[PDB]
Amino acid sequence: NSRYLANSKENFMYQANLMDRLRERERRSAALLSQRQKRYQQFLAMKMTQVFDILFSLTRGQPYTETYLSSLIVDSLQDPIGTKEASEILAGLQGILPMDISVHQVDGGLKVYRWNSLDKNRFSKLLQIHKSKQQD
Amino acid sequence: SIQECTTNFRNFLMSFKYKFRKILDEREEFINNTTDEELYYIKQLNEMRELGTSNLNLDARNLLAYKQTEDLYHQLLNYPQEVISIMDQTIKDCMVSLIVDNNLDYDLDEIETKFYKVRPYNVGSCKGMRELNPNDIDKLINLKGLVLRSTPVIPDMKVAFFKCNVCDHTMAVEIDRGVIQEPARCERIDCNEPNSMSLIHNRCSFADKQVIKLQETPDFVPDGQTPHSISLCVYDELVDSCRAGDRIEVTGTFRSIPIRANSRQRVLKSLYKTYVDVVHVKKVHNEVEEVRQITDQDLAKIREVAAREDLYSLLARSIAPSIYELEDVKKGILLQLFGGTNKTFTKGGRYRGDINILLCGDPSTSKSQILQYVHKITPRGVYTSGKGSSAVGLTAYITRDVDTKQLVLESGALVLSDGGVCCIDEFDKMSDSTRSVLHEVMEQQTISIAKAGIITTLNARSSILASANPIGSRYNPNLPVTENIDLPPPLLSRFDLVYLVLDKVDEKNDRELAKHLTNLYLEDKPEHISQDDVLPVEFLTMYISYAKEHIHPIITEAAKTELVRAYVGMRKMTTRQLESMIRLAEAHAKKNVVELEDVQEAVRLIRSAIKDYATDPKVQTGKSVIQRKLQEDLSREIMNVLKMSFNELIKQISSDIQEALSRLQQEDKVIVLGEGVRRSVR
Numbered sequence A: 001n002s003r004y005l006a007n008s009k010e011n012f013m014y015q016a017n018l019m020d021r022l023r024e025r026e027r028r029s030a031a032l033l034s035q036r037q038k039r040y041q042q043f044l045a046m047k048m049t050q051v052f053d054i055l056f057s058l059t060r061g062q063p064y065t066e067t068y069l070s071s072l073i074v075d076s077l078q079d080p081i082g083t084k085e086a087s088e089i090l091a092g093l094q095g096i097l098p099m100d101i102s103v104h105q106v107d108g109g110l111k112v113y114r115w116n117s118l119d120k121n122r123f124s125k126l127l128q129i130h131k132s133k134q135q136d
Numbered sequence B: 001s002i003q004e005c006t007t008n009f010r011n012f013l014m015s016f017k018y019k020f021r022k023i024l025d026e027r028e029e030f031i032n033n034t035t036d037e038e039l040y041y042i043k044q045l046n047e048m049r050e051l052g053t054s055n056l057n058l059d060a061r062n063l064l065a066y067k068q069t070e071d072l073y074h075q076l077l078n079y080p081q082e083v084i085s086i087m088d089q090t091i092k093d094c095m096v097s098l099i100v101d102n103n104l105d106y107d108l109d110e111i112e113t114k115f116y117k118v119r120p121y122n123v124g125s126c127k128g129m130r131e132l133n134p135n136d137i138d139k140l141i142n143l144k145g146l147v148l149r150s151t152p153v154i155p156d157m158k159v160a161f162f163k164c165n166v167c168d169h170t171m172a173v174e175i176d177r178g179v180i181q182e183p184a185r186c187e188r189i190d191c192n193e194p195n196s197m198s199l200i201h202n203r204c205s206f207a208d209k210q211v212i213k214l215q216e217t218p219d220f221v222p223d224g225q226t227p228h229s230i231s232l233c234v235y236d237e238l239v240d241s242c243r244a245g246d247r248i249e250v251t252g253t254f255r256s257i258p259i260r261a262n263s264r265q266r267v268l269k270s271l272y273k274t275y276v277d278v279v280h281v282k283k284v285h286n287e288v289e290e291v292r293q294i295t296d297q298d299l300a301k302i303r304e305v306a307a308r309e310d311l312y313s314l315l316a317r318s319i320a321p322s323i324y325e326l327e328d329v330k331k332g333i334l335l336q337l338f339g340g341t342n343k344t345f346t347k348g349g350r351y352r353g354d355i356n357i358l359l360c361g362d363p364s365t366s367k368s369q370i371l372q373y374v375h376k377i378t379p380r381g382v383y384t385s386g387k388g389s390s391a392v393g394l395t396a397y398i399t400r401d402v403d404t405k406q407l408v409l410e411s412g413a414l415v416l417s418d419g420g421v422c423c424i425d426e427f428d429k430m431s432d433s434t435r436s437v438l439h440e441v442m443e444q445q446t447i448s449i450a451k452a453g454i455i456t457t458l459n460a461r462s463s464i465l466a467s468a469n470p471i472g473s474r475y476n477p478n479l480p481v482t483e484n485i486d487l488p489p490p491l492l493s494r495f496d497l498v499y500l501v502l503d504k505v506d507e508k509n510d511r512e513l514a515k516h517l518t519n520l521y522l523e524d525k526p527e528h529i530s531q532d533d534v535l536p537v538e539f540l541t542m543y544i545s546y547a548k549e550h551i552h553p554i555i556t557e558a559a560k561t562e563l564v565r566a567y568v569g570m571r572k573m574t575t576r577q578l579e580s581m582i583r584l585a586e587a588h589a590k591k592n593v594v595e596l597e598d599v600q601e602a603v604r605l606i607r608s609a610i611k612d613y614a615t616d617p618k619v620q621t622g623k624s625v626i627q628r629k630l631q632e633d634l635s636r637e638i639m640n641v642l643k644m645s646f647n648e649l650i651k652q653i654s655s656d657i658q659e660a661l662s663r664l665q666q667e668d669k670v671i672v673l674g675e676g677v678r679r680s681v682r
Helices: A019-045 A047-055 A066-076 A083-096 A120-135 B002-014 B018-024 B040-051 B061-065 B067-078 B080-102 B108-112 B296-307 B311-318 B327-338 B368-377 B489-493 B507-522 B537-550 B557-571 B576-589 B596-607 B627-642 B646-652 B655-666
Strands: A101-106 A110-115 B140-143 B145-150 B154-164 B170-174 B197-199 B205-216 B229-234 B248-260 B268-278 B281-283 B357-361 B382-384 B421-424 B446-451 B454-459 B463-467 B497-501
Touching: A019 A047, A019 A083, A019 A120, A047 A066, A047 A083, A047 A120, A066 A083, A066 A110, A083 A101, A083 A120, A101 B040, A110 B040, B002 B040, B002 B067, B002 B080, B018 B061, B040 B080, B061 B067, B067 B080, B067 B140, B080 B108, B145 B248, B296 B311, B296 B537, B311 B327, B327 B357, B327 B368, B327 B463, B327 B497, B327 B537, B327 B576, B327 B596, B368 B382, B368 B421, B368 B463, B368 B537, B557 B576, B557 B596, B576 B596, B627 B646, B627 B655
Parallel strands: B229 B268, B357 B463, B357 B497, B382 B421, B421 B463
Antiparallel strands: A101 A110, B140 B248, B145 B205, B154 B170, B154 B197, B154 B205, B205 B229, B248 B268, B248 B281, B446 B454
């Protein structure tokens, strides 16, 4: 029994007790909205792990802007991740390895990334720490 | 000298401020004491270490500002073959001095091994392709042309790779001055066999080399001559940066390579193939940080005319001082040169901000003269005819090169004008295959051609300024507009301003028009007209290019409310008319915001052509009252006060207001008592 979203239960046609349930819907602004923000973190924490094993398995050192790095991730993962979701991947990877990835802002709204040495053993040990912190 | 140019360039990069560039540019009224006092070349050298680049965008105008680098700038334009090599070494010693002065824990071997290159551009020697004198061999000359075609990247061998066939000894021999010195004997002691080294081209370090065909700018080509072309050589990482139909600025050396008379012999012809080695690409990789166009002294005169309230009337007369009347027609063409801003969207569609004006009416009414004046002002404007250009000449005709005999793609009249106004003559005499192509240019500003298995979309964002003509060359007043002209109904709705310049027979108009045309032929210069009434052609082009790159009006809440009410009232008497009023109101203030006075002026231009008709196409005192009803309306408020100023009467209840007050004064009904307040009759 695996995940199979296919059932005939959807679209089956056909006092003040139910009014109290609508009052509890106001609590979803801090619970359902907070769960939506945590759902995007699950698609960013485990998604940035394979990204570091894709870009660093290629070039290094040379400067790379934010517009050039965003088009390379989408083109390599189209078989997807949009343009807005690709910008949050490189932003979350800076907090994990601040000594390996250098970010220098440009006066005009441009970010250039640069990395010297990217070790796979160091990133594998730090990926399990960031994944366990979001689960608590 | 080598030691003289070293100390001159070292002190220039360590003692340079932005105030020196403002001295030669006549900029003494806008000098800041917090940003101009800081060194500009120091921040550029610090960013190269952080980002990790290896190319410096050295500006040639900065060398002329310093008094100690006067002889250095003249030597760069002479023979930069030996000057650039010196700048590549002086920039290396300055990088090591910055590390010791900062005392950083970085790898010094990884920085010294990186070869830095200097890319000078924007020089003073702006010689064209026709002024290429033979004595300018190996000289950096700036070229201002247009890209025609693009060739694929051709690999250029730099380091040869050799390998023996007996002992398998791999070697690496570098190529010097295009000479591949092959080893005669093997370097191994156990081998030592002559003619035993094999050249492996698959293990060699190749370099990027791209050939770009540049076309001469039509603004510099004299009348009666055809613009030639030249070959460009792009190396390093600057390849794949210039597309077809882009205005760039090539400022590289002017080298030359000999040609061979035969492909099998070693002979050479007397002619030498000239080519320009591209060093820097400045569009008109990386990005421009700022521009220093025109002069700051001219900016004070620009703001002086902007402060005057008669700007809408002064620019309308200077755009065409040889054509009388046509005040409503010239007011629309003035906004077409400016045009609204281009609010680009990432997740939304592209909105066309250009103004499409279409002239109609009887011919011989100075219609062809307008199309000849806008082309001379716009730097990228063209002039074509109706039957002279079909659906192939306006799009992109598939031409062929007379050197490589390959199928190339040349731009047309609608593609070469990327940023100007296109003047098309005889718009009603076009074929059916040509009118269908303009439907996509006036909507998405894109030309999608799918012929010969090549389905590509060409961008064409430019305004269309044409002049229609009736069938029988006479606009009959008893016939509709759709029946007098053979233009498609969808083509008429795509335009923004549909002017109807008629040739009405008037004795008072023909007398004043003949005197204006006779004064232009009597004296070559308008001595009767003052200098502050007609602006020159050089000053008009500087006022449009400056406002189209810095002034960006934003539609506020008060301006957006009147645009919705004006759109509903026009339909109660298509969505293309709503976007026309946005670009018309934005070009009137191009002011950082859209005021209420700019929106009211755009409605008058639209109502000037779509009025006096409703269910059928094709005095006001007694029949249409107005004057009879205003006498009892304005006097009603005056009588209620006695039971006032001129500004209070308008707010409580303005050409008809002053006319009604003069009527009651003749009948002894009101008292003027000055222009301040008004007094009623005793």
